Amino acid sequence: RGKLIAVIGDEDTVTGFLLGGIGELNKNRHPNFLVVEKDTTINEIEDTFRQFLNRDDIGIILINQYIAEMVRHALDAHQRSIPAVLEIPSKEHPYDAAKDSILRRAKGMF
Amino acid sequence: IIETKMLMGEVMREAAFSLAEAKFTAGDFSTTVIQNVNKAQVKIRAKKDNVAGVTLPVFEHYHEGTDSYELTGLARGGEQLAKLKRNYAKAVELLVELA
Amino acid sequence: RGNVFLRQAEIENPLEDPVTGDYVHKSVFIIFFQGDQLKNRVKKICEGFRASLYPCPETPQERKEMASGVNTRIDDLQMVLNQTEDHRQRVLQAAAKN
Amino acid sequence: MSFFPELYFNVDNGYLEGLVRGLKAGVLSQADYLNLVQCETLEDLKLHLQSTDYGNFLANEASPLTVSVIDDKLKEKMVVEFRHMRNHAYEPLASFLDFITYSYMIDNVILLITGTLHQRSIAELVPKCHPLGSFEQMEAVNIAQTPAELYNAILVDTPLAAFFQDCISEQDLDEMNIEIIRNTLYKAYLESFYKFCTLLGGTTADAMCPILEFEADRRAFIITINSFGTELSKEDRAKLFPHCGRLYPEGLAQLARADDYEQVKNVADYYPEYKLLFEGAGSNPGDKTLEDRFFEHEVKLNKLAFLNQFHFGVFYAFVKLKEQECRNIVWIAECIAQRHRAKIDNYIPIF
Amino acid sequence: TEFWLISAPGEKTCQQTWEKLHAATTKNNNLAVSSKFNIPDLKVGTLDVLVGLSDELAKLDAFVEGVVKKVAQYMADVLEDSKDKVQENLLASGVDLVTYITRFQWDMAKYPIKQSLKNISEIIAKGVTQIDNDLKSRASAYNNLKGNLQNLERKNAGSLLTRSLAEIVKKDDFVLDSEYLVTLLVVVPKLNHNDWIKQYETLAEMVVPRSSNVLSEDQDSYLCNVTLFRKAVDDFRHKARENKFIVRDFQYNEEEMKADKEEMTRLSTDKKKQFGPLVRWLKVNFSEAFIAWIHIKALRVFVESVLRYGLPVNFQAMLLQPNKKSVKKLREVLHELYKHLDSSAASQQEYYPYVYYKIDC
Amino acid sequence: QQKYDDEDISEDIKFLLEKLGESVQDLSSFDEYSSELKSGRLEWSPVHKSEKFWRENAVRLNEKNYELLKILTKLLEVSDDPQVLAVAAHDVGEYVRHYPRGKRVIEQLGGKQLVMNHMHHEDQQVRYNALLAVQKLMVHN
C-alpha cells in the first residue's frame, strides 16, 4: 500500500506494464508513467526521471537499456537502496550484461 | 542473478509476442489503455530483511484488487487482452522478486 | 422451524412512521428461540423486510422501572422541544416585518 | 425501380465500379505469400511488398527497418483511397459511405469523451484520432473540456447526431463508463444500418443483410462469452446485444441466460453455420480461437458478396477486405521482425 | 433417472406396510412403483447447530452432485464404451442403477452413527475430495497423453510441404560430401514440373549441369531438387521463385525420423495399456462416489424428517416412481393426503406439507 | 478587501493583523481561564468561540474529580448575575458538546434541572442560552 512501481518506456512497454495493473494518479494527479518516443527530448526525460525519484511514494523504477543510456550519468549518479532503479531488456533493446549499475557495483567478481 | 534476469528476458519475449497478437486480433486499444489511468492495481508493502546482523530493504507484491478495464467494444477483444493481462501479472511479481 | 409460544399484542392509534410519515396500524407477534444460528438469520431476514430490533425487554423489573422513569423524562424532553418551536416561531415575524 | 436495376444502377454506379475494380488488383494472393515467407529478412520483405501494387510506398521515409511505418503507410493509402472514391459518390452510395464513415466517427467521438475528464485541448488529440473522422465542420476544435460543450458540439454538424439524439445524451455520458457508451453507439449504428439496407432492397440488400446479421450474431456470442466473468449486469448486456441477427427471431433470449461458454456453444447449436465455427474454436496451442473463426467467416461472407458485382459492397466489402489484407501484412511483418516462425502463418488468407 | 422420496410423521404402526403398498395412500392407484426406504436410526446430537448443519449439508450435497455429474461427463468424454448417448448403461457397482436405488443398502461399519453426523459428513467430504483431486490429476495426465497422440498426428497431418519425407526419399538424393554445392529441394508443382527440367541450366550459373533428375511426384506438388553453389542458392531461389518453383530445403535424417515414429508407436500401445485401466479407475471412482452420494442424500432426508416431526425417531418414508404425465394428479392427491398432517399454517411455494427431495439423471 | 497603491498601508495592515492574532493567542489560555473561573467573576472571554480550546483542551475542565465542573455548578446554583451565569451555561454546554462522560456526570449531578431553571430566568437572552445548553445535553437523550 506504501509504494508504487514506476514506468518510463516506449508505447509498447508502457501499454504492457499498465496492463500489468500498476499506475496511479498522485496528489497533483500526474501519471505514474511517462511516454518516451523518437519525438521526446532529453531534458524532458531527465526532468521527469528526477520528478519521479523525488516523489518518495514510488519506490521502484523501471527503465530499459536505451532510456537509461541516454541519461547515463544521471543514472549512475544514484547510489541508494530504497528508491531502486531497474535495468530491464527490451524487444527493441535486448539486454547487454556488461551494462548495469548494480553489476557495476559488483564489477570485478567473475 | 544473471540467470533470473535471462529468465525475465524469456518471459518478456513471450509478453511481446502476446502483445503482437493483441495488436493483430483487435487492431488498436493502446491509446485507450494509456488514456484511462486513475488508480493502480498492484502496490508494494515496504519491508526489511534481517539476513545478517545488518538489515537490507525488501519489497512485497500486493494485489490491491482494482477492477481491470473491460475491452468489449473493439472487436470484442476480451480473451486476448485477458491473456496479455495474465502474462504481465506474472511479469510484475517476478520483477518484484528481482527488485 | 420455530415452535415456541406467541406473545401477542396490538397497537391502536398508530403514530406515524418515525422516518416517513405513515399512520398505518401496527401489531407485534413475537416468539423466542434458542438457536444462535436462528438469532443470526431470522434477524437478518426481518431487517431485510422490516423490523425494529433496538430494545430488549427483560422480565427483571429494574429495567422496567428504569424505562418508566425515562418515559417520565420524555415529557419534560418534549416540553423543551415545544419551547424550541416557540423560540423559532417568535423569531420569525420580528424579521419578516422589515 | 420495380426490381429492375441496370437501366438505373449502371448509369449511376459504373463510373466508380470500374475504378474500384481496377484498384482491386492490389490485394495479394496465396501465391505472393509463398514467396514473401521465403525472405528471412526485412529488406527482402520490403522488396516483395514493393514488387506489388504498393510500388515504393515507403520511399523517402523510415530508413531503418521497422514494422510500424509499414502499417502507418498502409492506413494512409487506405484513407486517401477511401476519401478519393467518396469524393465522386452518388446519393445512395453517398449514404452508404456516410454510414461506413459513421463506423469510425463513433470511434472518434468516443475518443473525444474523457477529454473533458482530463482537461485536454483538441489540437493535441488531433493526431491521436484516426484521420477518417477529420471533422472539417464548425466547432470541431476547442470543446472547452466541458461535457455539455462536447454534447452540443457533436449535435451542431456531426452527422452522427441524427442517431445519437435517440439513444444517448450529455447526462448519459456521465453515468456509465466509456466502454458501455462505445458498445451502445456501435449497436445503435449497426441496427440503423441494417434497417437502411433492408429498405434499399435489391442485390445490395441481398448480399449485405446476411453480413450484418452475422455481425450482430458474432457480437452477441463473443459478448456473452466475455461478459460471463465481469461486473456488468444482464440488463446492460440486453441493452448491448444487437437485435438484428439471425438469432433475433430466436436465440437472443437464450444468450441472456447462457453464462458458460459451453452454453454459448449450445445456443450456437441453434444456428448451424455458427456451430461449425464454434467447432473450429479450439483454444489450443496450434489452432485459432472463436473470435478468429468469426473473423474468418466474416472474410468468407465478404468473398461470397464479392462473387456478385452489382452492389454497393464494392465500397463496403472492398474496404474491409483491404483491412484484412493489411492486417495479414502487419502480422507477417511483426513476426518476421521478432524472429518467431511458430506462427508465421497465423492469419486469414484472402483467396 | 427421475425418482421421488417422501417421508411422513408415522403416527400409526400400520404405516410400516403403508410405506410399501397402502391402497388409500397409494400413488396412481397402485401403479407407481413404491418401496419402503432402508431406514436407519441415528442419534439426535444437536438441534441448535442442526439447522446450519443441514444447510451446509445441502451446499455439500450440491457440491457432490456437481462432482458425480462431472465424473459422468468425463467418462462420457472418454467416448469409448461409455457415453451420454450410447453404452450409457453403466451399472451401479455391478448392479443396475434403478435396481440399487430400489435395493439401497445401508451400512454402519463405514460410517458409525455413534460419531457425530458432522463427523460422517466431513469424512464423506474428505473422501470425495481425494477422489476429485485424483480425478483432476488423471484428467491432466491421460488427456495430455491423448493430446500428445493428437499432436503427433498433427505432425502426420498435411501435404508433403509440411509432412516429413522419412519414408519417401533416401539419403543419397542430395550430394553427400558436397564440395561447394547444395542439392536445394525446389519442389515444383505439376503445372511447372516440365519447365525446370530444361530451365535449370539458365536459372543459375556456377552450378552442376544435367541436374534435371526428379525425385518423386505428388498430388499437390512434384518433389524435385537441383545442385548448385552455396552462394548461388540465393541467386537461383530469387530467379526461380518467379517461375512457380516453390523452394523447400528438406533435410534427411534416418535416426531422428525413426525415433519419432518409434515414439508414436510406443505412445499408441502404452495408451491402450493405460486406457483400459483408466476406464477401470474411472468406474470405481464413480462407483464409490454415487454410493456415498445416495447415502448422504438419505442422511439429509433423515435430518429434515427429525427436524420436522418430533422427539421420537418414529417416522416412515418410501421411494416413489410416478407414471409419466400423471404426477400432477399425484401432486393434488398427495397434497390432500399430507395436508391433514399439518392442519394449520403450512401460500406453499417450496414449503410443502410433506418432506421431499428430487433425484434425477 | 480595500486595496491601495501605498505599500505602507499593506505592510502596516499585515503587521497589525499578525500581532492582533498573536495577541488573541496569548490572551487565550486555559490557565487564566480556570483562574477566573475560580475567582468568582466571569466575562465573555474570546476563548468561548475558540473551537481549538473546546476541541483539544476541554478535558482540562475535568480537574481533580471534576472540581471545576463542580464549582461551576455551584456558581450556577448560587450566583444570580445574568452575565456570568450565561457564560457558565455556555461553557458547560460547549464542554458537554465534546464529552459523553461529562454528559452522564452532569445527568447524575442534576445540573440539567439547574439549566432548566435557567431556561426560566428573568432575562430572555439567558433563557435562550440555557435552552442551547440543554440542547447540548440532548444528544441521544
From Swiss-Prot, chain A:
GO BP: any one term: synaptic vesicle lumen acidification
Membrane topology: Peripheral membrane protein
Major localization listed first in the record, in broad terms: membrane
Alphabetized Pfam families for the sequence: ATP-synt_F (PF01990)
Assigned GO CC terms: ATPase complex; clathrin-coated vesicle membrane; proton-transporting V-type ATPase complex; proton-transporting V-type ATPase, V1 domain; synaptic vesicle membrane; vacuolar proton-transporting V-type ATPase, V1 domain
InterPro entries in alphabetical order: ATPase_V1-cplx_f_g_su, ATPase_V1-cplx_fsu_euk, ATPase_V1_fsu_sf
Source domain of life: Eukaryota
Compartments, record wording: Cytoplasmic vesicle, Secretory vesicle, Synaptic vesicle membrane; Cytoplasmic vesicle, Clathrin-coated vesicle membrane
Gene Ontology molecular function terms on file: proton-transporting ATPase activity, rotational mechanism
Subunit comment: V-ATPase is a heteromultimeric enzyme made up of two complexes: the ATP-hydrolytic V1 complex and the proton translocation V0 complex. The V1 complex consists of three catalytic AB heterodimers that form a heterohexamer, three peripheral stalks each consisting of EG heterodimers, one central rotor including subunits D and F, and the regulatory subunits C and H. The proton translocation complex V0 consists of the proton transport subunit a, a ring of proteolipid subunits c9c'', rotary subunit d, subunits e and f, and the accessory subunits ATP6AP1/Ac45 and ATP6AP2/PRR.
Protein's name in the database: V-type proton ATPase subunit F
UniProtKB/Swiss-Prot annotation, chain B:
Protein's UniProt keywords contain Transferase: no
GO biological process, alphabetically ordered: cilium assembly; protein localization to cilium; synaptic vesicle lumen acidification
GO cellular component: ATPase complex; centrosome; cilium; clathrin-coated vesicle membrane; extrinsic component of synaptic vesicle membrane; nucleoplasm; plasma membrane; proton-transporting V-type ATPase complex
One term of GO molecular function: proton-transporting ATPase activity, rotational mechanism
UniProt keyword annotation of Transmembrane present: no
Location(s) in or outside the cell: Membrane; Cytoplasmic vesicle, Clathrin-coated vesicle membrane; Cytoplasm, Cytoskeleton, Microtubule organizing center, Centrosome; Cell projection, Cilium
Main location: membrane
Record keywords, A-Z: Cell projection, Cilium biogenesis/degradation, Cytoplasm, Cytoplasmic vesicle, Cytoskeleton, Hydrogen ion transport, Ion transport, Membrane, Transport
Domain of life: Eukaryota
Main function: Subunit of the V1 complex of vacuolar(H+)-ATPase (V-ATPase), a multisubunit enzyme composed of a peripheral complex (V1) that hydrolyzes ATP and a membrane integral complex (V0) that translocates protons. V-ATPase is responsible for acidifying and maintaining the pH of intracellular compartments and in some cell types, is targeted to the plasma membrane, where it is responsible for acidifying the extracellular environment. May play a role in cilium biogenesis through regulation of the transport and the localization of proteins to the cilium.
Family membership noted in the UniProt record: Belongs to the V-ATPase D subunit family.
Curated annotation (Swiss-Prot), chain E:
Pfam families documented for this protein: V-ATPase_C
Protein name: V-type proton ATPase subunit C 1
Cellular localisation: Cytoplasmic vesicle, Secretory vesicle, Synaptic vesicle membrane; Cytoplasmic vesicle, Clathrin-coated vesicle membrane
Disulphide bridges: none
Cellular component, GO, one term: apical part of cell
Gene Ontology MF terms in the entry: proton-transporting ATPase activity, rotational mechanism
Family annotation (CDD domains): V-ATPase_C
Subunit structure comment from the entry: V-ATPase is a heteromultimeric enzyme made up of two complexes: the ATP-hydrolytic V1 complex and the proton translocation V0 complex. The V1 complex consists of three catalytic AB heterodimers that form a heterohexamer, three peripheral stalks each consisting of EG heterodimers, one central rotor including subunits D and F, and the regulatory subunits C and H. The proton translocation complex V0 consists of the proton transport subunit a, a ring of proteolipid subunits c9c'', rotary subunit d, subunits e and f, and the accessory subunits ATP6AP1/Ac45 and ATP6AP2/PRR.
Tissue spec: Ubiquitous. Abundant in brain, liver, kidney and testis.
Organism of derivation: Mus musculus
From Swiss-Prot, chain F:
Subcellular locations according to the entry: Cytoplasmic vesicle, Clathrin-coated vesicle membrane
Function: Subunit of the V1 complex of vacuolar(H+)-ATPase (V-ATPase), a multisubunit enzyme composed of a peripheral complex (V1) that hydrolyzes ATP and a membrane integral complex (V0) that translocates protons. V-ATPase is responsible for acidifying and maintaining the pH of intracellular compartments and in some cell types, is targeted to the plasma membrane, where it is responsible for acidifying the extracellular environment. Subunit H is essential for V-ATPase activity, but not for the assembly of the complex.
Family the entry assigns: Belongs to the V-ATPase H subunit family.
Subunit structure: V-ATPase is a heteromultimeric enzyme made up of two complexes: the ATP-hydrolytic V1 complex and the proton translocation V0 complex. The V1 complex consists of three catalytic AB heterodimers that form a heterohexamer, three peripheral stalks each consisting of EG heterodimers, one central rotor including subunits D and F, and the regulatory subunits C and H. The proton translocation complex V0 consists of the proton transport subunit a, a ring of proteolipid subunits c9c'', rotary subunit d, subunits e and f, and the accessory subunits ATP6AP1/Ac45 and ATP6AP2/PRR. Interacts with AP2M1.
Name of the protein in question: V-type proton ATPase subunit H
Source organism of the structure: Mus musculus
